[PDB]
Design a protein around this ligand. Sequence first.
Ligand SMILES: *[C@@H]1O[C@H](CO[C@@H]2O[C@@H](C)[C@@H](O)[C@@H](O)[C@@H]2O)[C@@H](O[C@@H]2O[C@H](CO)[C@@H](O[C@@H]3O[C@H](CO[C@@H]4O[C@H](CO)[C@@H](O)[C@H](O)[C@@H]4O)[C@@H](O)[C@H](O[C@@H]4O[C@H](CO)[C@@H](O)[C@H](O)[C@@H]4O)[C@@H]3O)[C@H](O)[C@H]2NC(C)=O)[C@H](O)[C@H]1NC(C)=O
Ligand code: HEM
Ligand SMILES: *[C@@H]1O[C@H](CO)[C@@H](O)[C@H](O)[C@H]1NC(C)=O
Ligand SMILES: *[C@@H]1O[C@H](CO)[C@@H](O)[C@H](O)[C@H]1NC(C)=O
Ligand SMILES: [Ca+2]
Ligand SMILES: [Cl-]
Lengths: 107, 466
Amino acid sequence: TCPEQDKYRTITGMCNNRRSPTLGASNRAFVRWLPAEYEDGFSLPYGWTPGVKRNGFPVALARAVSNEIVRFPTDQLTPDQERSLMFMQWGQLLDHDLDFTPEPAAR
Amino acid sequence: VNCETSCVQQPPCFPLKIPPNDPRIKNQADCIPFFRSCPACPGSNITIRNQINALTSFVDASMVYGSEEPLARNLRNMSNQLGLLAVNQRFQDNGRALLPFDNLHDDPCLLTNRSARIPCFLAGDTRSSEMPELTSMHTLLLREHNRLATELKSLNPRWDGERLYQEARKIVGAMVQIITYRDYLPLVLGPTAMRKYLPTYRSYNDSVDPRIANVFTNAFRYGHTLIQPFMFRLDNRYQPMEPNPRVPLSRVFFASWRVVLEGGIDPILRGLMATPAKLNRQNQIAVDEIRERLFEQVMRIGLDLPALNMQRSRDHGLPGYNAWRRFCGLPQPETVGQLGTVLRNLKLARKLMEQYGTPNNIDIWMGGVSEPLKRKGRVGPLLACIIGTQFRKLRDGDRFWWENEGVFSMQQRQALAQISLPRIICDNTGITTVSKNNIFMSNSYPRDFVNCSTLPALNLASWREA
Ligand SMILES: *[C@@H]1O[C@H](CO[C@@H]2O[C@@H](C)[C@@H](O)[C@@H](O)[C@@H]2O)[C@@H](O[C@@H]2O[C@H](CO)[C@@H](O[C@@H]3O[C@H](CO[C@@H]4O[C@H](CO)[C@@H](O)[C@H](O)[C@@H]4O)[C@@H](O)[C@H](O[C@@H]4O[C@H](CO)[C@@H](O)[C@H](O)[C@@H]4O)[C@@H]3O)[C@H](O)[C@H]2NC(C)=O)[C@H](O)[C@H]1NC(C)=O
Ligand code: HEM
Ligand SMILES: *[C@@H]1O[C@H](CO)[C@@H](O)[C@H](O)[C@H]1NC(C)=O
Ligand SMILES: *[C@@H]1O[C@H](CO)[C@@H](O)[C@H](O)[C@H]1NC(C)=O
Ligand SMILES: [Ca+2]
Ligand SMILES: [Cl-]
């Protein structure tokens, strides 16, 4: 723990890095490239408390931003002449090799 | 609580509120369900809240084999000494293997077709059944492991169940790395960002942090802009397979029955190869099939994926657009005019300023996908930076990277370099005509297609232990 010589990967990902064996292993905290920005500083997300502005400006509803910017007529779709749908589908498959962020169940 | 059925904002629920004059949800008292991603340090006053990664960060095919030992042990065929993965015991795709069914309490896959009675599949990742296109990819990799374990048994009859499994796992894991870093990523980042963030591989660096960044989980959601509103299926002659060639995406989510009953993985894979993806345009970001009708069949109401992405970034406490621009060494626009110059779109810059008030407040996914794409790439400068920085850490910080000294022999690497996704399809399906390399670029039939006979299979001669 860790074995001094190994031939294959562990399932959990443990021992891939000898000096810090938990790095890249499953069921561990994400690394941060920037300090987190929360409403209360440590826990509450932005848009949690009504009236509380982010950086001096009111927080926009995620659905409202989706309505005004993301939304477009379906029959107006532009097909990619240089990419296949496999280009999209490999992306998801690869994403599911890298990360899954768990959520509590009900209740 | 439930966050799935209630609109009250109490932990761990953070539901999306409904704006006035919403095109779909007329009721303002209603809301979009959202569970907060559970913290790594529950109910702490001291630590800043951070989220958990349930999987191995490494490109090690953990979506096939699993990231936890109890799950990984259940996915294997434990009956014999062949080192195979467990296959479906009730159904088969024209004689070929399928993923085994999952024993879940509240199975969403049953809700898609009530008379079908086809539950969700069991794989290394829990989301395997989310869409039949993803299921087809999971099934293909399962067959590849079994095919490799069979051929390794011929080369080495002395090898037991454990040895055969691990050796085949090592190859499939290497296969995903090669297709990702040689075929996939260069087409995401473009040639310019590919050279910047992923230069020629040297060797393993034990000082490189291989962990997944919190921002990457939201940033790599760029592919939601590539999603087509339909699932496309074609017959062996690459023609619209009847009577459902163009099925709306809102009716394919968790529809595991469409794989088992309506043909198999062959028509779905032929569709992904011969159908163009959606192009990310500034006024055409994401289709309404995922923006209005996400999981419409298995939930009380249809979800808004792009909005769920933006809500999640706030849940994860991720900084705004400009903070990540500064992180990457990219200019940070202050005014609407400056944002217009960065986006090459003043009209879009106005709409973003109407919502956010400042480029500092723009959600990472929103500002990321809004940027004009890099030449021969499918992401803007910002997303290319985050995605590029991440994948190098996964490469250089991986001791079991396929190119690393001691992982494979010289002839093993030389044989592994010959692998391709079209060839994996040839070896594991009934499809005889597949896409030309690059597979992610080839999208038109019959212009971009060749026969399997012209494509050589993986040579496992160097795996012989004489
Ligand atoms: C093995 O890899 C590690 C990690 O490499 C990183 O990841 C790679 C995938 C790739 O992206 C690469 O570009 C990354 O560096 C390598 O270790 C790293 O070496 C570099 C260069 O020596 C280090 O940069 C230095 O960091 C010093 C720390 O000071 C500060 O740290 C603060 C907290 O994070 C941060 O706010 C600051 O930004 C700053 O980094 C700093 O004192 C150094 O200053 C320089 O001094 C130079 C002259 O001595 C001068 O030319 C230059 O202008 C500048 O003033 C410098 O920035 C980095 O910190 C190392 N990272 C780690 C985690 O160890 C290692 O080189 C690789 N080894 C092999 C064998 O290749
Ligand atoms: C097949 C088409 C896709 C989906 C169906 C789908 C769905 C989701 C959902 C519902 C989430 C959760 C969002 C939330 O927090 O509420 C999700 C997250 C992630 N995606 Fe999505 N996605 C489809 C397509 C893709 C493609 C092609 C991706 C890759 C380019 C992609 C990425 C991601 C990533 C990295 C996540 C976060 C994973 C995590 O749990 O940490 N998606 N997807
Ligand atoms: C295990 O392999 C054997 C022989 O190949 C096969 O008959 C059986 O179906 C497999 N078991 C499972 C559960 O996949
Ligand atoms: C559900 O699946 C059954 C097969 O069991 C099929 O007959 C039926 O058409 C499907 N329902 C629809 C209309 O999608
Ligand atoms: Ca992994
Ligand atoms: Cl981060």
